[PDB]
Write a protein that binds this ligand. Structure first.
Ligand SMILES: [Ca+2]
Ligand SMILES: [Ca+2]
Ligand SMILES: [Ca+2]
Ligand SMILES: [Ca+2]
Lengths: 317, 317, 317, 317, 317, 317
């Protein structure tokens, strides 16, 4: 259902990239940097004796109150930190499974995406469809009002907040996540170049046009099809639509990443077509590597979790 | 998958009704009535020689700009009017198929629901999930900020606007729609008692708890399941959740309807369980009737469209 | 699952055309023209004040009694007429939705196909399979006894009957229909060259061999696969079978069409493959046009209905 | 999806039986007995040294030419005979697998059903639907014109023809078949009481109303649902329809069977619900027995074939 | 698809329990206790600085070499230990996600089931089917040769080995697992009463007969259906089959558990019917609790992971 | 989903062939030939008067007790014999349907494959997975311990046993089977060159790598995918795995076949891809022929059974 591996290795993407892409994002970062986070920490009901578990809240662009789990090991001195991002429609998950990295002495943070399955706020205020999908949310509004634009900014802002924590060495921060979380990991490391390590598992939010070309604009990408069916049935605004989506196409932000990257891709993945994953991978200029799993689809790949941790452990000296 | 027809005719609903239901709605109607609609009519690109086609815009509660197709026949004197409501995620549709009632001398209006498939605006500004579903949109916010509360008010406000049109006899306005449109038809006739005729085809938005009890909280009702899975996995707040959804349960509004009602239900419809449809039907106190289609599911039922027009044509003496 | 749009534009078909195709149809036309229609009109139970609704019955070839809905506006003088054809296994449908064109002053006729979901008779009398499918009905009999041959003749015969109606301007007649109805519309305009306008939506009954070549001989075209599995499992008579089906392949009749044609096609339509639709379209020699819907399948395409009406309204001076 | 075995044992049926059922069938038998079979035997291209293989053709009611495979062992004297009936839409099948009974010295005959997958003719000539299904074929016509009525007569007529074969002992004839073939076997033994043995495997064509009551009027019984959806959507003629189908309900003919009967039923069979099978079984008044297969559906049941042969071998002294 | 919660609470099971159940297991334990484990530890390629990761191998009954991951924290003194068991056809998984409990100072062990997805050996040597399923593996052989009998013994033996580790406090050992792993957790805590804590998530291997009664002997329990279809199609040995399966029905071993138990059940779980889960739960006599997730099926339930860890942390003083 | 018939006829396979293929098999044949079969014949409970039905047991390699149905006609002198092999997970089936060849004077033998649906024993004793699949059974053990290696030897040993039966003409033995039975037929005729006739219907166990390349390593070939997913997720040992599977790839054994071969293939068969079937066919050097069924999948093909018997009947002069 996608090109052979031989060609994936060379594929660099299909979705257009706005001509003012750089200006667009420099502007976005300016807005993010002018925000007063007014950070608040609340002790979680979940408690362990070897670490402090806090519910962290900060204000992002447009006044949205963002939430993230925050686990701090009870150890002296500064150390590495890991920021996890979750899948589409999910949330930061349970506290306990974040402790595997705390065991390694890491501070661990897991952010909730605005308006999805967690406790992060989506202030809305956009024109157009609001029933299904965040990718097309704000698509018929001004480009600067696209929801994933704010979400991407939240990850960048959170990375800076984490880097300012007293127990965190700002030069030893890594980000990780699967699918949407993998796309957000790339976006975060792109918008906050200080991020040192990046683990992106079968990333979502990449090379939109390609997904549509493969007749795969379904499942997680169904909203792109819904959009055209309802607002441009004969595709009279196709190029403008995909160009605008180019603003939130991680394959376009990929060139900004400075940290080391480790990715994985399942060749049976029809949710996030292998070609869209390689497009993001092939736009990365920093040190990188990608693990290929021929028989896996959009799912955790056996053994990769271990490769990812060993990769993250590289944050220590 | 549901109770026998024998029991259906006796079923009055399961979903709870808030203690302050009436005051909640009188309070909502007060808000709607205090809004300056600033009505604007723009000529449509679709034009015929026997009628006037206009895109109508008005401001609803919370400042949302609402859109509706508006077709006026080129005849003299006042006459009946029909207000159509559409299915979940859809829109007012095409202009041409609305002309069947125009041929009958009716003014035809088809409203687009906020943030769905048309041109009506959803101003948002709610806390909680915004990724999928309007039923749960605002569920974790104040009850007065629930999206379908505003949408229901839009239907009532539009009915009032239509009743003030120069060519419309305010005492001869009918409403109609399938699924979501069927629930909206009931809500509209309930909130604007002046509505004279009502056609509700396999109505959606009714008896939420019942849908869940039958393990049918999927398909169109999937979001109710996602809500619990993400925000209350062990149903510790079950009664509170369904009670709040009770505010937008059209079965609870039904008692207010004064116009004549004609409904249809498919006994194979698992999207809108027959019991939930009968629950709404059985709460109506005005003159009513329901057509039963044993072998039909969530779909147009052969012959009903004709029964619906003959029913609407009763508006003429 | 089909060639790219770029290639579809140049695709002219795969299914063969019998060497005696022309003589076959001229002989077929002679047979129908010799039939005494014995037309009878019966007032319908469905009635409105602005039009006359009649159930029309006429005798077609082989003594079959054919039925069609007939709506005549209560206006003065001659005017255009629209003849609608329905989907496979369906019928003429409801009376009310045909009134959109009556609003435009058109006489509207909707024919029921022999032995399908309506009230038209299939006298049968053929050898071979009679359990499933009209495409293969009479395939093992003489070619002059193939059921769709008679059905095509019914459309041409009905077109002439309509052109002889007192209120109908014989030079202002249009035909329209989706899927099977789209194929019948083409066949009608081909067998009755006086037809002025043609709207063919995702036409069925075209380029049979191509459907099979694409492994799409299922769904609506399943009977073709059943025929071979049961009567020619090793395809020893493949060319003979498809050539014979060529007699009722609308892409072969398309060359005879003189009226203007407006078609629509969904690129995700696997029921009527895009290539088979373009094959019919590319064989049309009269003024034509085709609307392409990239994200639509075998279903009504948003906005096309309005395009079709504006197209039909061109029949008025 | 059906009642427990405990209840199945006592279930006698739901579908009605016409008050003139008996006269209907006696009149039907008189018609077939007046037909001149004009039997013709043609040597088959398939030949073996130990038997004679012929394609047998005889004329049935309404002038239909019926076909059946006919294998005669090259032995001396009279012996038993087995008549096989096939599944819905299938045919008599291959010659070789019929030889298992020829090995036992049986003459084997396998009839093709009119207009299905074989070489038997369906003269048609009925009013109503002819697109899908033989159960509803002729349902809107006179009851004496229902297709399965003629097919049942074909089995009885064939049974008599076989009983008149020189090498066949008329008192040692057995009939067998699965699904449709199981229903035909029952009908045959009912209309031709001389039939000595009967093997009916998960019989189709039984207790129609029950199939519909269970919401299983799909798959093989789909046409019943199609009939109502198209010709009686609100079931205003429900009792009339099912009572008429009672003429061809094998559970109503079962009382006439005189030969011993061996049946089998799969409790997971949703195509032919267990209750409809037991309904036919429980109406049999002759020596009978039924093998129950808890984990089998609409399919051959392991070991039953051997039970069936040992049962048929009882025809030998 | 299963009884209401009200009745689940009281349901105690349906599958029989052999009369010599106790003798059978006392005998099995004797065989296990006579085995020389000949334990061998091999450093894993996966290494972290805060713990020792070893591949542990021991010999179980019948000479099978069993494998389990073994992670020991680099801390002084004795402490609690957790033994994880995996799902059907899976294995011990990755090393990294086991570190969440190591962070809590626990020694963590994850055993691979014989012949499944890991490195544990199944010496086989049984008669009967060996193609699919371990539940019926050895079912046609002597009861003492049933594979899950050995597997259960492996868990008990491993628990004793863990309790003998120098860094492990033998009175602070817990076991946990989902589905098959949940069934194995119950079996382990039953056969090694010293186990102090038990977390069983939607347990598999319980109340076999019940699964079959609900027509749910499919998916994970498909082999039970396969067995009957192939070896006892008419269920002539039904009681003997299910009674024999009673030897490895965890609901029967449940009464032996002494440690505290925490379980979870998804009411939408058709893989492990809620009733079979409550049957095991209701046979437990030690301190216990069960978390119900109405909208979850056979899958991890949000929040439970955290309840499970807090429950396990109860092992410390 | 596969290459065009034009290319199929030229395709010779993709799966590698071990360098020591021949010695591996000569070594295997040596082992089989050194086994004392200790043949035992037990009269079956199924008995007919024209043939002798016996359950035959013999010891194969590794001490496994193998079972086969054995039917001998009550005729004088030596005659042909037919050995049938069954489908994956199935068994020899019923006795009665084997009598068609008995009627032709043949002795008919139907072998049960070790550990599948019949009475043949799989002694096991292998390391690695034992939960699902015989193709990978023993794959992680020495190549000489692979299960299908022993099964292949069982077919060869049984052929030799049959050729020594007093009523059997050793030069007139044919083998036949579908799917797995088709692969076993080829393996048998390859390992026991004396086999005179071969019928292989849509053979399984051929060209493994090709199945994987087409993403068809599912359904019957699912275990190959499970193997990689669990034991080599990144395919680091891909060539080694497929090369080893090459030992039991019937396409590699095909070159040894001396008897005449007749095969059939369905072009819609995704279970046993057409290419893999043609790969085996194209490696045969003896007289051969293949029947192509374009519209058939993994299923019996109409008419082939008769071609198969006529082909086998060629054994008589
Ligand atoms: Ca480092
Ligand atoms: Ca004009
Ligand atoms: Ca006897
Ligand atoms: Ca404690």
């Amino acid at each position: 259902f996608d090109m052979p591996l031989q060609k994936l290795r060379e594929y660099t993407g299909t979705n257009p990239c706005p001509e003012d892409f750089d200006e667009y994002w420099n502007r976005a970062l300016d807005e993010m940097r002018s925000v007063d986070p007014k950070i608040e920490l609340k002790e979680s009901s979940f408690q362990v004796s070897f670490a402090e578990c806090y519910d962290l809240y900060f204000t992002g662009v447009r006044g949205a109150r963002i939430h993230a789990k925050y686990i701090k090991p009870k150890t002296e001195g500064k150390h590495p930190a890991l920021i996890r991002f979750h899948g589409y429609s999910s949330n930061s998950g349970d506290w306990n499974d974040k402790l595997n990295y705390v065991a390694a002495g890491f501070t661990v943070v897991a952010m909730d995406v605005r308006g999805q399955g967690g406790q992060s706020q989506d202030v809305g205020g956009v024109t157009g469809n609001t029933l299904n999908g965040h990718i097309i949310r704000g698509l018929d509004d001004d480009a600067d009002n696209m929801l994933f634009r704010h979400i991407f900014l939240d990850t960048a802002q959170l990375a800076g907040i984490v880097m300012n924590m007293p127990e965190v060495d700002e030069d030893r921060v890594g980000v990780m996540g699967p699918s949407q979380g993998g796309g957000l990991s790339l976006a975060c490391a792109a918008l906050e170049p200080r991020v040192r390590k990046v683990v992106s598992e079968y990333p979502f939010l990449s090379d939109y046009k390609r997904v549509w070309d493969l007749d795969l604009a379904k499942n997680a990408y169904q909203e792109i099809t819904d959009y055209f069916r309802l607002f441009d049935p004969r595709h009279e605004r196709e190029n403008e639509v995909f160009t605008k989506l180019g603003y939130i196409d991680v394959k376009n932000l990929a060139k900004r990443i400075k940290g080391d990257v480790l990715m994985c891709v399942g060749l049976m993945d029809q949710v996030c077509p292998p070609s869209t994953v390689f497009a993001a991978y092939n736009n990365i200029q920093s040190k990188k590597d990608i693990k290929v799993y021929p028989d896996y689809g959009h799912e955790p790949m056996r053994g990769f979790g271990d490769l990812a941790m060993q990769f993250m452990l590289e944050l220590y000296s």
